[PDB]
Design a protein around this ligand. Structure first.
Ligand SMILES: COC(=O)[C@@H]1C[C@H](C(=O)O)N[C@H]1[C@H](CC(C)C)NC(C)=O
Ligand SMILES: CC(=O)N[C@@H]1[C@@H](O)[C@H](O)[C@@H](CO)O[C@H]1O
Ligand SMILES: CC(=O)N[C@@H]1[C@@H](O)[C@H](O)[C@@H](CO)O[C@H]1O
Length: 387
C-alpha cells in the first residue's frame, strides 16, 4: 500500500551521525564521479545517497569545467548509503540537471529536467519508466527542489519554479500520483520567491523550507496538504536568519516578507518546524558557504523574536559546506518520524581554484532523543593532493 504520513516527528534533543561517504578523499585515487546538489532518500527496504553527476570522474580530464550547473552530461544518480558515487556502483535514475525523487510506498517516482535555458523539460519517471513530461512555462531554466519529495497515500507534491532567479518568478506545486498529474497550483501565500525546497512529512502535512534567491535572508516555507492538494506559504518569522550569504541576525524577524540585506543569491537549506521541537540549519558564516550548525529555535516559524535555546555544530567554520536538505526514513520501526538531514560539502571552485573542478562529498545526520556529544564532520580531502 502507499505510505501515509501518520506519525509525528520524534523529539529532537541532538543529532547522531547517519552517513558520510568521504567521496572526494576516496575519489583522489579511485573512479568516483563528480557531482553536486546531492541528497538522501529512502525506500521501504533501503536508503540511498543521491546526486547530479557531471558525467566524468574527479581525476578525469573532463572534470575541468564542472563548476557549470547545466550541461548535457549530467544525470540524477543514486548509490549505496555512505558509499561514494563511483562509475561502477552508481545507478542512473534519469538524465538532466535538476531533480527530485521519492518513493510512495509501492515504487519510486523520479523527476529530471534538461534542455537549454529557454526551453527545458521535465520527465517524470515512476517505477523506473518514463510516464509524464512537462515543458517549460516561463522559458527560463525550469527547475526543482534538488532533494527528495514527500508522498501521502500515493500523492506526491513537488515544488517547481520557472523564470528569473533574481526577481518575480513562476512557481508551481504539482501533485503527482503514479507519475501522473492529478493537479497543479500556482504558488500562493506570502512567500515572494521560491527555489530548491527541502521537504518532509508528518501527520498528513508536508512542510517545505525553501530558498528566496532574490530578496530574503530568512527562509520561505510552504506547507502542503496532500489530501486536499492545497498549500500556503509564509516566511520563517524567527530573527535567526538561515540563508547565505546573509546580513547579521537582528532581534526581530519577518513573517510575511523577505528579510533584506542581500539580493540575488542564496543556498539550498532546510528546517524542522515542530513547535518547541523546532530546529534550523544554517552555514555558520554569513558571507560564504563555510561551516554548518543546527539551532533549536522554539516556534521559529511563528515567533518573530525566537532565539536559540540549544545547538550543535555539524561542520566547523573553517571547513566548506554547501547545500543542505531534509529527508526521513518513513518506513522505520517506531512511533515517530526521525528527522534527518544531509549537508553537501563542496570542494573545488570557486573557493578552491587551484583545481579546475567542483565536486563535493556528503555528511548526513538524524536526530536522537538523547543529548549526544558533538563532533564536526569536514569533507576531509587535501586539495594539495589533486595538484
Ligand atoms: C543544479 O544546479 C544548481 O542547483 C545550481 C547550483 C547553484 C548554487 O546556488 O550553488 N545555483 C543553482 C541554479 C540556481 C538557479 C535558481 C539559478 N540551478 C540551476 C538548475 O541551474
Ligand atoms: C500501509 C497502509 O496502511 N496504507 C494505507 C492504505 O492501505 C489506505 O488504502 C490509504 C487510504 O486510507 O492510506 C494508507
Ligand atoms: C587543465 C586545463 O588545461 N585547463 C584549462 C586551462 O589551462 C585554460 O587556461 C582554461 C581557459 O582559460 O581552460 C581550462
Amino acid at each position: 500500500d502507499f505510505n501515509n504520513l501518520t506519525k509525528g516527528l520524534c523529539t529532537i534533543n541532538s543529532w547522531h551521525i547517519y552517513g558520510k561517504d568521504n567521496a572526494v578523499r576516496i575519489g583522489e585515487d579511485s573512479d568516483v564521479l563528480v557531482t553536486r546538489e546531492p541528497y538522501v532518500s529512502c525506500d521501504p527496504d533501503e536508503c540511498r545517497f543521491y546526486a547530479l553527476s557531471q558525467g566524468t570522474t574527479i581525476r578525469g580530464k573532463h572534470s575541468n569545467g564542472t563548476i557549470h550547473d547545466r550541461s548535457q552530461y549530467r544525470a540524477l544518480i543514486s548509490w549505496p548509503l555512505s558509499s561514494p558515487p563511483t562509475v561502477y556502483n552508481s545507478r542512473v535514475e534519469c538524465i538532466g540537471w535538476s531533480s527530485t525523487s521519492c518513493h510512495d510506498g509501492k515504487t519510486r517516482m523520479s523527476i529530471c529536467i534538461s534542455g537549454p535555458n529557454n526551453n527545458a523539460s521535465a520527465v517524470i519517471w515512476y517505477n523506473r519508466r518514463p510516464v509524464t513530461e512537462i515543458n517549460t512555462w516561463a522559458r527560463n531554466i525550469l527547475r526543482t527542489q534538488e532533494s527528495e519529495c514527500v508522498c501521502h497515500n500515493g500523492v506526491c507534491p513537488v515544488v517547481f519554479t520557472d523564470g528569473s532567479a533574481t526577481g518575480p518568478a513562476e512557481t508551481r506545486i504539482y501533485y503527482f500520483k503514479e507519475g501522473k498529474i492529478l493537479k497543479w497550483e500556482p504558488l500562493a501565500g506570502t512567500a515572494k520567491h521560491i527555489e530548491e525546497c527541502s521537504c518532509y512529512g508528518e501527520r498528513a502535512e508536508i512542510t517545505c523550507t525553501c530558498r528566496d534567491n532574490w530578496q530574503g535572508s530568512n527562509r520561505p516555507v510552504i506547507r502542503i496538504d496532500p489530501v486536499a492538494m492545497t498549500h500556503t506559504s509564509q516566511y520563517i518569522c524567527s530573527p535567526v536568519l538561515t540563508d547565505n550569504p546573509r546580513p547579521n541576525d537582528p532581534t526581530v524577524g519577518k513573517c510575511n516578507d523577505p528579510y533584506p540585506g542581500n539580493n540575488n543569491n542564496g543556498v539550498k537549506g532546510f528546517s524542522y518546524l515542530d513547535g518547541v521541537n523546532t530546529w534550523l540549519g544554517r552555514t555558520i558564516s554569513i558571507a560564504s558557504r563555510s561551516g554548518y550548525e543546527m539551532l533549536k529555535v522554539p516556534n521559529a516559524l511563528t515567533d518573530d523574536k525566537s532565539k536559540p535555546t540549544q545547538g550543535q555544530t555539524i561542520v566547523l567554520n573553517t571547513d566548506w559546506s554547501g547545500y543542505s536538505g531534509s529527508f526521513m526514513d518513513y518506513w522505520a520501526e517506531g512511533e515517530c518520524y526521525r528527522a534527518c538531514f544531509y549537508v553537501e560539502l563542496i570542494r573545488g571552485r570557486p573557493k578552491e581554484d587551484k583545481v579546475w573542478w567542483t565536486s563535493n562529498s556528503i555528511v548526513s545526520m538524524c536526530s536522537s532523543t538523547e543529548f549526544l556529544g558533538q563532533w564536526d564532520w569536514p569533507d576531509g580531502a587535501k586539495i594539495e593532493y589533486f595538484l
